[PDB]
Design an enzyme around this catalytic site. Structure first.
Site, PDB file in Angstrom:
ATOM      1  N   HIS B  11      67.257  46.035   8.325  1.00 55.86           N
ATOM      2  CA  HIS B  11      66.367  47.194   8.366  1.00 55.86           C
ATOM      3  C   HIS B  11      65.259  47.213   7.320  1.00 55.86           C
ATOM      4  O   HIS B  11      64.540  48.203   7.195  1.00 55.86           O
ATOM      5  CB  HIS B  11      67.176  48.487   8.314  1.00 55.86           C
ATOM      6  CG  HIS B  11      68.128  48.646   9.463  1.00 55.86           C
ATOM      7  ND1 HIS B  11      67.701  48.882  10.756  1.00 55.86           N
ATOM      8  CD2 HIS B  11      69.481  48.596   9.515  1.00 55.86           C
ATOM      9  CE1 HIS B  11      68.754  48.978  11.554  1.00 55.86           C
ATOM     10  NE2 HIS B  11      69.847  48.812  10.826  1.00 55.86           N
ATOM     11  N   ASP B  17      53.968  42.823  15.578  1.00 58.89           N
ATOM     12  CA  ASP B  17      53.870  42.784  17.031  1.00 58.89           C
ATOM     13  C   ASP B  17      55.134  42.217  17.695  1.00 58.89           C
ATOM     14  O   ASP B  17      56.199  42.123  17.071  1.00 58.89           O
ATOM     15  CB  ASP B  17      52.614  42.003  17.452  1.00 58.89           C
ATOM     16  CG  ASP B  17      52.231  40.915  16.444  1.00 58.89           C
ATOM     17  OD1 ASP B  17      53.145  40.223  15.947  1.00 58.89           O
ATOM     18  OD2 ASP B  17      51.022  40.753  16.142  1.00 58.89           O
ATOM     19  N   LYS B  35      70.245  42.727  20.299  1.00 60.58           N
ATOM     20  CA  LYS B  35      70.334  44.128  19.908  1.00 60.58           C
ATOM     21  C   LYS B  35      69.192  44.831  20.618  1.00 60.58           C
ATOM     22  O   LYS B  35      68.054  44.353  20.593  1.00 60.58           O
ATOM     23  CB  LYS B  35      70.205  44.290  18.386  1.00 60.58           C
ATOM     24  CG  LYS B  35      70.762  45.612  17.857  1.00 60.58           C
ATOM     25  CD  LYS B  35      70.602  45.719  16.342  1.00 60.58           C
ATOM     26  CE  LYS B  35      70.899  47.146  15.868  1.00 60.58           C
ATOM     27  NZ  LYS B  35      70.658  47.288  14.400  1.00 60.58           N
ATOM     28  N   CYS B  75      61.597  47.302  16.954  1.00 58.63           N
ATOM     29  CA  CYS B  75      61.666  46.239  17.953  1.00 58.63           C
ATOM     30  C   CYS B  75      62.516  46.679  19.164  1.00 58.63           C
ATOM     31  O   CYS B  75      63.679  47.046  19.021  1.00 58.63           O
ATOM     32  CB  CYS B  75      62.235  44.964  17.315  1.00 58.63           C
ATOM     33  SG  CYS B  75      61.294  44.379  15.856  1.00 58.63           S
ATOM     34  N   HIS B 108      73.290  52.356   6.329  1.00 57.56           N
ATOM     35  CA  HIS B 108      73.121  52.525   7.777  1.00 57.56           C
ATOM     36  C   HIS B 108      71.775  53.143   8.135  1.00 57.56           C
ATOM     37  O   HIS B 108      71.294  54.047   7.445  1.00 57.56           O
ATOM     38  CB  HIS B 108      74.258  53.388   8.339  1.00 57.56           C
ATOM     39  CG  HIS B 108      74.063  53.805   9.766  1.00 57.56           C
ATOM     40  ND1 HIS B 108      74.330  52.965  10.829  1.00 57.56           N
ATOM     41  CD2 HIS B 108      73.652  54.979  10.307  1.00 57.56           C
ATOM     42  CE1 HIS B 108      74.075  53.599  11.963  1.00 57.56           C
ATOM     43  NE2 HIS B 108      73.665  54.822  11.675  1.00 57.56           N
TER      44      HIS B 108
END
Ligand SMILES: [Zn+2]
Lengths: 114, 113
Positions: B11, B17, B35, B75, B108
């Site tokens: 993260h 892009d 994911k 993403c 998290h």
């Protein structure tokens, strides 16, 4: 006075991101106190001017001086075993009066034993 | 701290892009299998850490919300197979983020936001 600069380096953090063990383990290295592991070290928080004034109106004699006002502080204390880095620490956040040594109008030492 | 280092890997990317996403998702181990959605926070890591402390504030159940917004890249998987090779598109964003913390460290990221 580089001594006062050094006081601030070792005992001053205005707006701390935290007040826990990890804050201490971070701060103790950042502030040059881990070669070797310093056993006990207090960071004073808040406005710098109130600390400096302990040497005057915000102080009374204690060769030392005790603050006439209380301060947010965080005391870092070594743990883990022997004092080889990497240095582990625990933190005690506090709100109390502090004792410092002043010389020629400026704080130069913090008294941990108080 | 495994949980904290996993948070950074999954993260955090300091310095946007589809190709960014496709390589990043793969390099950081989020492609076996694919994911579906994953956000990278950009910027200063101390600012992110500080969400657990001074720069954050209590949120819902056991969570925390940033006081300042962060540049982010989310993403989103494309294609019909949940298996790699994983293709992604990017949504560049700028907003507050919600995380959970443990012992003053981020562990998290909350994707529902
Ligand atoms: Zn998909």
């Amino acid at each position: 006075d580089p001594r006062y600069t050094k006081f601030l380096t070792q005992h001053y953090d205005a707006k701390p991101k935290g007040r826990d063990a990890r804050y201490c383990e971070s701060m103790m290295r950042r502030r040059g106190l881990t070669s070797p592991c310093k056993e006990v070290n207090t960071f004073i928080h808040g406005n710098k001017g109130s600390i400096k004034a302990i040497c005057g109106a915000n102080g009374s004699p204690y060769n030392l001086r005790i603050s006439q006002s209380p301060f947010q502080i965080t005391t870092c204390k070594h743990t883990g075993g022997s004092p080889r880095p990497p240095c582990r620490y625990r933190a005690s956040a506090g709100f109390r009066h502090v004792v410092i040594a002043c010389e020629n109008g400026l704080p130069v030492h913090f008294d941990e034993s108080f």
